[PDB]
Amino acid sequence: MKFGLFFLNFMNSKRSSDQVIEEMLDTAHYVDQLKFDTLAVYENHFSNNGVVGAPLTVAGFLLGMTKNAKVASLNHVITTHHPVRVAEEACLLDQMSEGRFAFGFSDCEKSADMRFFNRPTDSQFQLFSECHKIINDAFTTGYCHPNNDFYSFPKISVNPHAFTEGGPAQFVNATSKEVVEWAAKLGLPLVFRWDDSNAQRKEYAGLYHEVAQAHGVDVSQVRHKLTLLVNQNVDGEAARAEARVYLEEFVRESYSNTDFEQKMGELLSENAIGTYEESTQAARVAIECCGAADLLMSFESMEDKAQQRAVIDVVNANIVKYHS
Amino acid sequence: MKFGLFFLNFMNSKRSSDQVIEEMLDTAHYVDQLKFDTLAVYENHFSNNGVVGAPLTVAGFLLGMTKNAKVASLNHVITTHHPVRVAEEACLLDQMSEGRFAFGFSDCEKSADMRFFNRPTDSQFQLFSECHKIINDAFTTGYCHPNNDFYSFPKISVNPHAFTEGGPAQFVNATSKEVVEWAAKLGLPLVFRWDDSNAQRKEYAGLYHEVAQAHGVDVSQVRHKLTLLVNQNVDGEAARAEARVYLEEFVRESYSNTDFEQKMGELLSENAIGTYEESTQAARVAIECCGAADLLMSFESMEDKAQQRAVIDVVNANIVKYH
Numbered sequence: 001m002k003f004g005l006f007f008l009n010f011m012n013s014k015r016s017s018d019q020v021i022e023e024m025l026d027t028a029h030y031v032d033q034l035k036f037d038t039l040a041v042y043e044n045h046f047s048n049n050g051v052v053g054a055p056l057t058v059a060g061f062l063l064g065m066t067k068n069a070k071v072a073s074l075n076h077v078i079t080t081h082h083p084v085r086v087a088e089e090a091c092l093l094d095q096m097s098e099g100r101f102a103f104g105f106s107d108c109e110k111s112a113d114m115r116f117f118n119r120p121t122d123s124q125f126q127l128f129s130e131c132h133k134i135i136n137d138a139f140t141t142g143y144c145h146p147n148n149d150f151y152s153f154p155k156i157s158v159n160p161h162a163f164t165e166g167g168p169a170q171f172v173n174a175t176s177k178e179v180v181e182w183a184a185k186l187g188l189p190l191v192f193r194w195d196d197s198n199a200q201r202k203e204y205a206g207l208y209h210e211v212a213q214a215h216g217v218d219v220s221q222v223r224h225k226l227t228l229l230v231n232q233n234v235d236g237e238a239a240r241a242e243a244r245v246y247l248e249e250f251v252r253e254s255y256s257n258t259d260f261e262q263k264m265g266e267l268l269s270e271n272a273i274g275t276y277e278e279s280t281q282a283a284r285v286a287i288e289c290c291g292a293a294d295l296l297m298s299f300e301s302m303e304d305k306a307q308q309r310a311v312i313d314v315v316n317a318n319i320v321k322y323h324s
Numbered sequence: 325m326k327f328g329l330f331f332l333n334f335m336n337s338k339r340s341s342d343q344v345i346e347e348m349l350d351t352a353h354y355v356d357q358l359k360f361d362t363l364a365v366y367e368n369h370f371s372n373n374g375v376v377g378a379p380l381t382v383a384g385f386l387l388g389m390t391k392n393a394k395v396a397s398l399n400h401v402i403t404t405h406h407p408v409r410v411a412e413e414a415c416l417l418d419q420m421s422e423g424r425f426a427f428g429f430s431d432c433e434k435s436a437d438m439r440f441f442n443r444p445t446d447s448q449f450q451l452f453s454e455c456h457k458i459i460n461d462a463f464t465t466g467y468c469h470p471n472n473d474f475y476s477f478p479k480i481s482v483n484p485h486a487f488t489e490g491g492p493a494q495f496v497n498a499t500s501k502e503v504v505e506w507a508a509k510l511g512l513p514l515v516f517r518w519d520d521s522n523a524q525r526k527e528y529a530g531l532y533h534e535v536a537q538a539h540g541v542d543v544s545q546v547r548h549k550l551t552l553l554v555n556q557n558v559d560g561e562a563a564r565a566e567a568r569v570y571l572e573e574f575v576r577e578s579y580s581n582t583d584f585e586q587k588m589g590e591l592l593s594e595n596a597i598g599t600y601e602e603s604t605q606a607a608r609v610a611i612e613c614c615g616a617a618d619l620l621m622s623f624e625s626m627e628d629k630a631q632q633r634a635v636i637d638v639v640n641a642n643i644v645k646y647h
Contacts, residue, residue: 017484021419045412051483053412060381061420064388081409082441088369088377095345096385116477117406153440159368159375160341 001287002294003320004038005031006074006227009051010246010300017051023300025065031312032068035320039066040074040104040227040296045113049250056089063097072102074191074227074296075173079108079127080117083134083151084144087158091138095163104191105132106173125178126150139167171225174204184211187222192290194227194298195254198270201226201290209291226292228283229271231301232311236274243273243301272297276314325611326618327643328362329355330398330551333375334570334624341375347624352386352393354633358640359647362394364428364551364620367401369437373574380413387421396426398515398551398620399497403432403451404441407458407475408468411482415462418487428515428549429456430497433578449502450474463491495549498528508535511546516614518551518622519578522594525550525614550616552607553595554623556635560598567597570625596621600638 005027009020028039041058044050052058055073062071071093078086086105093101107128108114114121130150137144138158145155162168172183174190183190190208192201205224212219233239247267255263272283287295297315302308331348335341352363365382368374376382379397387395402410417425431452438444445451454474461468462482469479486492496507498514507514514532516525529548536543557563571591579587596607611619621639626632 011483018419018487021416021484025420046480046483052416053483054380054409054416056381057384057413057416058420060384061388061417064385064390066388084440085378085405089381092345092376092378092381093385095342096349096382156370156440159335159370159372159377160345163342 001323002037002223003315003323004036004040004070004294004296006040006042006296006298007052008042008049008298008300009044010250011048011051012249015303020051023305027299027308027312028062028066030309031316032066034312034316035324036069036316037294038070038072038102038296040072042074043077045116047253049253056086056093059093059101060096063093063100066100070100070102071097072171073104075104075106075109077108077113078105078131078135079124080113080119081131083131084138084156084158086131087135087138087144088160090135090168091158091160091162094168095160099164099168101168103168103170104173105170107175107179109175125182128179129182136167136170138162174201174208177204177207180204180207181211184208184217185215187212187215187217189222189224189293192224192226192292194229194271195250195267197266198286198289201286205289205291223293224291225294225296226287226290227296227298228286229267229273229301230279230283230297230299230311230315231271231273232276232279232314233307234275236278239274239279240268242303243268243271246301273301325647326361326547327359327639327647328364328394328549328618328620329360330364330366330620330622331376332366332373332622332624333368334574335372335375336573344375344624347629349389352390355636356390356393358636359643360640361618362396362426362620363390364396364398366398367430369440371577373577380410380417383417383425384420387417387424394424394426395421396495397428399428399430399433401430401432401437402455402459403430403448404438405455407455407470408462408480408482410455411459411462411468412484414459414492415482415484415486418492419484423488423492426493426495427491428495428497431499431503433499449506452503453506460491460494462486463494498525498532501528501531504528504531505535508532508541509539511536511539511541513546513617514548516548516550516616518553518595519574519591521590522610522613525610529614547617548615549618549620550611550614551620551622552610553591553597553625554603554621554635554639555595555597555625556600556603556638557626557631558599560602563598563603564592566627567592567595567625597625 007024011017041055042050043055045053059071127150134144139162142161143157171189171191174180174192231239231243251264272279299308333344365379366374367379369377383395414427451474458468458470466485467481495513495515498504555563555567575588596603623632
């Protein structure tokens with residue numbers, strides 16, 4: 001397996017956007033040297049729960065400041081951005097970094113964002129697919145020629161052309177069944193979300209697998225990713241309490257209909273939170289029920305830098321290093 | 325006077341997109357430990373005359389791989405881009421680099437280019453002024469509230485909030501009198517374009533000065549920039565020749581409705597091309613015409629790497645000694 005790191009960059013009343021970014025940078029540098037495989041960037045708009053609106057811009061600096069690791073967009077929302085712009089941007093990252101960029105994308109998750117980006121809601125999936133078609137066309141051919149109600153424009157050359165044949169590796173955030181089946185037919189690898197339950201995650205995997213074989217897809221060769229929150233404390237009970245506060249607002253905005261306490265409790269126990277073992281096992285379960293080949297972890301919940309790096313070190317030392 | 329570099333990143337059948345990106349990268353590094361103050365990036369779409377459509381993404385990488393270096397968008401076309409996105413993107417860079425990014429922006433230099441990204445209009449300059457309005461609001465307040473017609477969205481927050489108080493330094497491309505007047509009115513510094521004639525630049529410079537002062541602006545503190553192409557050769561004729569081939573399709577493209585030979589001949593003579601002497605002379609002249617505070621140069625037209633780097637060498641020593 002491959003083990004990497006993701007940054008959510010959640011902000012708060014005390015913990016500022018300035019701080020988070022800096023922490024992100026310091027950590028990135030810290031693990032540069034280690035056995036971590038990839039550094040993923042979470043996109044979020046208009047809220048405390050993620051201060052990175054432009055994952056691609058962040059990826060440029062991250063790639064710029066590094067030489068080792070791979071950098072990826074975790075959930076680049078294509079559905080609310082112009083596909084041509086995405087292609088160009090992704091292409092530039094691919095070239096500048098000589099193929100170290102990985103393109104993680106997603107459909108629009110919040111209705112607000114969609115409306116906010118003057119995007120037709122009633123046909124979201126169609127638009128998402130269309131946006132995707134434009135991007136992949138660019139990646140794979142160097143050009144685009146849409147002729148539809150979403151886009152209609154004279155054939156164009158999209159510069160720069162991909163450094164990596166076929167464009168930078170792609171992956172789809174598993175946000176829904178529609179998207180999952182879509183990805184299965186295309187045979188693209190997914191990204192199972194740390195915010196979802198194990199059940200959901202598994203159902204999703206059963207879905208993809210079913211669809212994918214149904215499409216002549218060699219599943220054994222598909223490397224799904226999984227994201228999980230990591231927070232290890234000798235006092236397992238404290239680990240939970242710390243992540244709880246870190247996820248308060250997220251749970252209160254993202255998972256509204258769903259009763260709070262139940263979800264919050266589910267997250268604390270399903271994520272790699274608690275003591276070493278507790279932590280370690282949760283991870284094993286998660287992987288197990290979703291079949292992911294690679295893991296990405298977020299250690300951000302650990303407000304203690306000394307404690308956080310410590311955790312990072314054992315994980316690399318006790319886990320990572322072995323898979324190499 | 326400050327001296328910086330700019331990248332056009334022009335490709336051709338012979339010189340691929342890959343090639344030119346690499347050279348920029350190398351170049352940026354090579355120049356890092358020098359006296360050059362800034363690294364500027366040119367935006368272009370769907371053509372060989374500029375392979376960088378997102379100078380902001382390039383700015384991130386460039387700043388990421390440098391530490392002392394100043395990086396800027398040369399002519400970011402805001403008109404075609406969501407103003408909100410633009411503000412986040414730029415605030416991110418401001419944060420990440422800790423104040424080392426400069427936001428050089430522009431107004432659509434093409435028409436057809438508009439269609440490929442937004443809803444083209446005629447009241448385009450209005451869209452542009454309103455876009456910049458949104459952008460500067462965040463830059464200065466962290467929030468924006470376009471009550472207007474182009475954009476209407478209630479009070480919203482833009483993260484990250486800026487690293488530099490007031491947002492990153494800004495500068496506008498003098499693409500027309502309309503824009504020049506707007507900038508002046510707002511007290512913004514301009515970027516005089518290497519592709520424009522010395523007379524136009526002087527004009528713009530004069531317009532800016534008059535409008536600005538009448539508006540209570542402190543012109544003394546305005547530091548406009550100027551771009552120029554740089555191609556020095558023992559054989560001044562060989563320098564023009566090389567530059568001519570590099571500028572061929574561009575002249576044909578950006579200046580399709582004017583006499584070719586004349587423009588061409590104008591560019592080759594007013595830019596810092598020729599012999600060292602002709603090059604420097606040409607430079608002084610252009611600087612004196614528009615009165616730029618800082619000079620950004622492009623040395624890309626010199627295909628021979630050793631010759632190019634040498635020119636860069638000569639320039640730097642030259643700044644170290646008198647600047």
